[PDB]
Symmetry: D2
Subunit: 254 residues, 4 copies
């Protein structure tokens, strides 16, 4: 098949990439970083994140594989040759994604971990509207909308719940909300199903720091930020069983 | 249709029940508390909880309606006559339920809010096993497994996330877990999809205080406590739009 | 000096106790468990807790030393002989204590870690009164009032802050408080200085499960539970520097 | 006495200021905003914060009074005339302050609420050193060191404990710390007594966003940030009893 390999950039990842390419040359495998059918990421979760966004316009035609030299990298470097033979002769598991829409022309972004909004300096104030219904006025440091696979990332440090990636949903968590006689927020994290639209609408300041996974851009003259579960999904190539809860156990428990 | 009405027991609920029965007598409505097709609960969430368990063996043939004199009671007392006329001439919305299985003969319970486990005196210690995989050893005050509609109840006070009832899932939260050099738990709440089985297995003490909604019984010589999303669902009769997030807003925000 | 040694009860602690007694026989040391001036605890924090309560009526005349075979046990077993020689030929550091007063005859208890109140079955409801001022009505699972040295124990798992033992204060934390349209608590932990009196007063149910360190007794017909920083302090014998924050680091960080 | 009045700037505060000045003209009161002995702040907590920093070099010779048109403003506007007569013919209560020292020439700042450190873009990473002892390596969004009176502000939203202002201490809370297999922080808030020095030392990035109450400046080429309880205190003029816990009750409970 058409494949490609991205590298973290250090010595260990660059050379593991060159050796896997050599082993692929002994099979009917064709290296192509323009229309690959397999995208292999060698490095960390940040490296895998970059590979996903590099090919986010052909997600429905690509299967991702991660090698940590990680959550999205569930393959050890010493198992590379077995991964070569396994890939040459698999099942695809799909994780949900988050669609972020920023209105001012409209701009849309796709997220594998989460998308967060913070102030451009000063207090962060937005009205939270759930399906055209005003739910709360948030005043604090920011908000974070996470995918299921992203719940073990930023969402976890903010007190969010960890949810299995088979659940097509998104989770919204708060960043240091003020709560007194005049300001009131739900405080608890919120989990939204598909087709539920969460709209963040500015009150006074219209400039916000908007992040999508590892990217963070200052957005000027913002009118609306819409969050919803994307119809697009990321596809993983799975050769062996590695349950999500076991991956959670190995990363945080023991 | 065959209907029945349960009452909180105070003067306001008992008399609202008698007046609704009188109005039902002016239509083709038959009072029957043995095989009712409509169960009307008048009181609070605890009153509705008792009505659900009173007819938990005929859930697939009953539509519940709540009147608060509440979360499950989404009808004001002054709207009773309109509810009578509306019911006489609706759509059914279904919420997921939690199945609790206690092994020692096996005992099974059905939950609308949550099921919790605490110690029978002393430290509460159980091994948490997710799909036959040992995830953690919990040592603390207890654990709480909540339905989606139950996430705004006990689950919320324990730091759990609020999730929409259209998501067929269950959420597990901790009660004062100890975490030091020797004891380690995930800390974050966990959200499980259907067909995922969470098994709590004792370590030394085998007596536990097990709750199912408002009931709490001491269980002796416990070998296993299994949690899973039930295949059974509770059915509500809906006459007007009242979104779950608006019900959340009115109960906690304003 | 007059000394005594208490043991955890296992083989390792019983024999380390007998060997230290033998080494003490080579100095001007007199074993006496009635009027000891040095109390050596060999085991864990629970063992040290029992030694403190065993001699809580002569605290101002006793210096405690802990050996973990721990927080209050800051001596390794292999350093026992050096501890014998050091003790034979020190500085005393003092930690604050918590006074608990239960009115119904009045009963008073002294705490090194904390004192907690829970319900005797059903919801736990008390009015919280701070210096004769009604601060809140607590409805939930319980409350915990911790000493400074106790903040790394139960208080920590409840979300309480860790505070240095040189601060003469007490910290109150919540256990799963309900907060909605009708019930409201502060949520945050509260730190009280000396001479501040925190009074918990029942509303309807008068039976409570009251704990003091490792002891837990059901108290019937309770009228008031008063918390205040005790004028009595526990005295430690210190031979080397071991800062509290380093003890915190070694127990939770690395 | 020599007095001065600062105003929020809106119509209600500007005119209440002019009327109080007129009433002061009927007594032996001299307006002086260079060497005032009484500083009256009319507005909100942010207005009072500006008055404190306006005269932070003569704190030991000034008594502050707050009027909310608040926590530091504990006087209603309708009680202004009584405040004029009361002031003409009081007791001083003192609150502790936080000293922040930034090394690169050395720069020192005084805080009434708190001082926070965040990254200049990217991850915030500092080593936390308590009394020349490495306690942890913090990686996350930031850290917050609060005074006692500041614990009800930013510290509260970050999960910090509320402590009485008579306790000469400072409290450190985390902002979204990452905790996994490689990163580990204490998580709990830390309360430090006087003479304890908390040093934050950079790891790689040396630019930080440092805040002191309402001011926030980007600091370049930072080598150390030292936190300690200041020897300086702010002095309030008190005419009637208004306990701190009652002020907490009125602001968050009812
Ligand atoms: N305050 C916060 N606390 C926790 N996480 C935060 C966060 N602020 C952003 N993030 C996160 O940063 C990610 C970008 O990096 C790649 C990744 C990944 C990543 N995905 C996951 C995942 N699905 N599940 C579990 N771990 C993950 N990781 C692990 O995240 C760590 C990487 N991050 C940081 O160390 C980091 C921490 C704090 C601040 C900045 C960074 C930073 O580097 O930017 C690595 O160990 C990865 O293996 C963003 O997507 C935010 O989720
Ligand atoms: N520590 C805890 N903190 C918060 N909740 C706790 C909890 N311990 C159990 N629960 C809960 O008690 C429920 C039994 O009661 C009927 C109900 C209901 C109920 N359902 C819901 C719901 N789906 N969503 C939102 N609110 C709900 N409510 C509201 O819950 C309040 C009732 N409870 C208590 O006041 C209460 C609080 C503390 C302790 C005991 C009780 C008690 O009464 O037993 C009422 O306002 C209801 O309207 C159990 O199912 C546990 O969920
Ligand atoms: N839900 C809770 N979560 C955390 N702690 C809780 C707690 N419920 C009570 N406690 C606590 O139990 C203590 C009685 O035990 C001796 C001690 C001690 C003890 N002091 C301290 C301390 N100053 N600083 C740091 N660690 C300490 N320890 C360490 O506490 C662990 C002992 N406890 C348990 O394992 C335990 C955990 C959960 C439930 C029950 C027990 C139990 O055994 O009763 C051991 O590792 C000790 O070294 C009570 O004083 C409550 O503070
Ligand atoms: N994420 C956070 N969550 C909570 N607080 C935060 C915070 N980030 C900074 N702060 C805080 O902002 C303060 C500057 O403002 C004057 C004051 C004061 C102030 N002192 C206190 C106090 N001792 N006790 C109780 N309330 C206080 N207040 C009340 O704080 C509210 C003012 N603040 C904001 O609304 C605000 C909220 C979020 C974000 C920005 C702002 C902002 O305006 O900058 C007003 O109601 C005041 O009455 C800084 O000192 C940070 O403590």
């Amino acid at each position: 098949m058409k494949y490609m390999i991205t590298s973290k950039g250090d010595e260990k990842s660059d050379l593991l990439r060159l050796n896997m390419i050599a082993g692929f040359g002994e099979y009917d495998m064709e290296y192509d970083d323009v229309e690959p059918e397999i995208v292999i990421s060698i490095g960390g979760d940040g490296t895998f994140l970059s590979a996903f966004h590099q090919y986010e316009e052909r997600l429905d035609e690509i299967a991702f594989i991660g090698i940590h030299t990680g959550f999205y990298a569930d393959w050890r470097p010493a198992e590379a040759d077995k991964l070569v033979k396994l890939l040459a002769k698999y099942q695809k598991v799909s994780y949900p994604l988050l669609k972020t829409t920023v209105k001012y022309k409209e701009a849309t972004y796709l997220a594998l971990n989460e998308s967060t909004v913070k102030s451009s300096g000063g207090p962060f104030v937005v009205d939270v509207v759930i399906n055209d219904i005003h739910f709360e006025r948030f005043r604090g440091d920011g908000l974070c909308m996470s995918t299921p696979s992203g719940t073990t990332a930023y969402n976890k440090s903010l007190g969010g719940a960890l949810m299995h990636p088979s659940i097509e949903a998104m989770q919204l968590t708060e960043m240091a909300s003020i709560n007194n006689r005049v300001y009131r927020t739900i405080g608890s994290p919120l989990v939204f199903p598909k087709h539920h639209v969460v709209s963040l609408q500015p009150v006074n300041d219209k400039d916000f720091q908007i992040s999508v996974d590892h990217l963070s851009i200052l957005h000027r003259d913002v009118q609306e930020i819409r969050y919803e579960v994307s119809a697009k999904k990321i596809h993983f190539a799975r050769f062996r069983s590695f349950p999500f809860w076991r991956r959670v156990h190995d990363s945080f428990i023991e």
